[PDB]
Amino acid sequence: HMTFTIESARSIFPDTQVANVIPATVASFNQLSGEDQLALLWFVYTEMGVTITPAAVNMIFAEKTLTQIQQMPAQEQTQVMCDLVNHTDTPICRTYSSFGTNVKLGFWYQLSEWMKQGIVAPIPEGYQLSTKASDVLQAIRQLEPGQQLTVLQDIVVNMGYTSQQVAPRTQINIEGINNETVLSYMENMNAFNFPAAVALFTEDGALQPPFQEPIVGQESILAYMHEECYGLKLIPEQGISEPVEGFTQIKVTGKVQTPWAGDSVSINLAWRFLLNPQGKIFFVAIDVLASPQELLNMGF
Ligand SMILES: CC1=C(/C=C/C(C)=C/C=C/C(C)=C/C=C/C=C(C)/C=C/C=C(C)/C=C/C2=C(C)C(=O)CCC2(C)C)C(C)(C)CCC1
Numbered sequence: 001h002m003t004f005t006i007e008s009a010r011s012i013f014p015d016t017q018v019a020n021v022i023p024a025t026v027a028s029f030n031q032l033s034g035e036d037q038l039a040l041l042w043f044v045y046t047e048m049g050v051t052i053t054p055a056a057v058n059m060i061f062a063e064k065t066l067t068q069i070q071q072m073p074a075q076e077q078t079q080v081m082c083d084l085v086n087h088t089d090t091p092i093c094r095t096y097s098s099f100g101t102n103v104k105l106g107f108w109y110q111l112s113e114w115m116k117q118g119i120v121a122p123i124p125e126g127y128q129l130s131t132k133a134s135d136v137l138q139a140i141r142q143l144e145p146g147q148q149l150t151v152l153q154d155i156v157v158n159m160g161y162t163s164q165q166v167a168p169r170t171q172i173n174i175e176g177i178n179n180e181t182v183l184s185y186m187e188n189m190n191a192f193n194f195p196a197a198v199a200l201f202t203e204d205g206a207l208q209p210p211f212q213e214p215i216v217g218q219e220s221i222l223a224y225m226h227e228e229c230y231g232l233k234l235i236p237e238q239g240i241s242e243p244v245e246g247f248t249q250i251k252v253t254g255k256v257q258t259p260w261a262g263d264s265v266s267i268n269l270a271w272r273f274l275l276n277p278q279g280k281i282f283f284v285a286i287d288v289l290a291s292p293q294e295l296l297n298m299g300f
Contacts, residue, residue: 003245006206006214009274009283013251016270019290021139021298022147023211026154028136034082036133041085042123043137044152045112050145054109056231056259062107065095070114074121081111084159096160100227104156105260146267149258150288154211164230167191174252177239181279182250182271186236194225201281208285210269231259236271247282248275253289 029037059066069080069092083090099107114120129137140151169187181200188197198218201207206214207221215224237254250273255266272285290298 004247004274004282006204006216006283009206010208010214010285012249012274012283012285013270013272016251016272016287017290017295018270019147019150019288019294021143021290021294022150022154022288025136025139025143025151028139029151029155032130032133032136034086035127036130037085038081039123039127039129040133040137040140041152041155042112042115044140044148047141048145048148050149050261050265052109052260053262054106054260056262057102057106059103059106059110061099061103062110065092066107066110068092069111070119077121083161087159087161089161089163093159093161094163097162101153101157102228102230104159105153108156144291145261146265147288147291149261149265150210150267164192166193169193172236174236174254175238177241177250177252179239179241179248179250179275179279181275181281182236182239182252182273185273185281185284186234186252189225189229189232189234192230194222194229197225198222202276205280205282206284208283210286210288214283233257233263235266246277248279249273250275 029040032040069077072080080092082088083093084096087093096104096107111120115122140148143151167190169191172183172187172190174182174186185197185200188194198221201218201221203218204216205218205221206216207224208214209224209228215221233256235255235257236252239250239252241248241250252271252273254269256269257263257266268289268291270287270289272287273281274283276282
């Protein structure tokens with residue numbers, strides 16, 4: 001007999017208002033053809049109004065592949081960027097799938113810079129998207145920047161073909177709760193003390209990133225934290241705590257800022273924790289919350 005499994009833990013606070021327009025838009029994007037995809041991504045990225053810094057984040061992992069692409073003629077450069085978006089089995093697509101999330105993003109950032117400088121073949125002057133791609137572009141363009149950044153990240157991480165400094169903890173407050181395991185988690189994540197944060201989990205515990213599967217076990221969670229969590233700033237604001245079957249479930253809402261955009265952009269999140277009777281994190285889900293505008297729209 002078990003009171004909770006990882007699977008059943010995923011459904012805690014089931015009426016959380018998740019921004020399902022994000023994966024909805026990604027699914028629509030994945031129905032478009034390679035050329036429409038690349039041109040759409042160029043317009044999203046360039047028209048977002050957000051300055052992207054690589055500086056606060058990595059690139060040494062991508063440099064050999066980047067040099068390769070830089071040396072290719074324009075015809076081959078564009079084909080490579082089509083293999084990536086189309087998920088074609090190629091050496092470069094397999095190498096890309098081994099990059100960490102932030103390495104993938106740095107990869108694409110450098111190509112974006114080279115396209116501006118005419119070192120990498122640009123999107124053709126005036127290339128006209130299909131009507132369908134034009135509808136996907138406009139839905140992306142309407143989203144708040146932080147949600148567009150999430151769309152892009154999700155698309156970038158899924159391209160290709162699949163075959164640092166610790167601060168001391170500083171005090172943080174969350175109105176409405178007094179849970180030390182939650183506060184330890186948030187403060188250790190802000191300090192980039194990822195071994196300390198992971199130590200709060202049960203050995204069989206999981207962390208569920210937004211719109212992704214649970215990452216199970218401390219070794220895996222730590223690797224993920226190394227890959228994706230450096231330079232994040234977590235700004236939990238408020239919470240509720242409820243006892244359930246001798247466990248505690250805690251929902252916290254607030255924001256994160258990514259080092260890609262600094263303090264110019266804040267993404268609205270929920271964190272959904274299930275703690276065991278000993279105060280260990282059995283499960284935590286992070287969700288991107290729907291805006292008031294998106295809730296309205298996805299009714300009426
Ligand atoms: C492709 C492509 C191009 C270039 C694209 C470029 C350049 C894109 C750059 C995009 C970037 C830079 C996006 C960055 C997004 C970052 C996000 C969205 C981060 C969100 C993080 C969150 C939400 C983390 C929350 C979490 C919390 C709070 C926890 O407690 C646990 C850990 C974790 C779950 C991590 C060009 C133009 C050439 C055209 C051709 C195709």
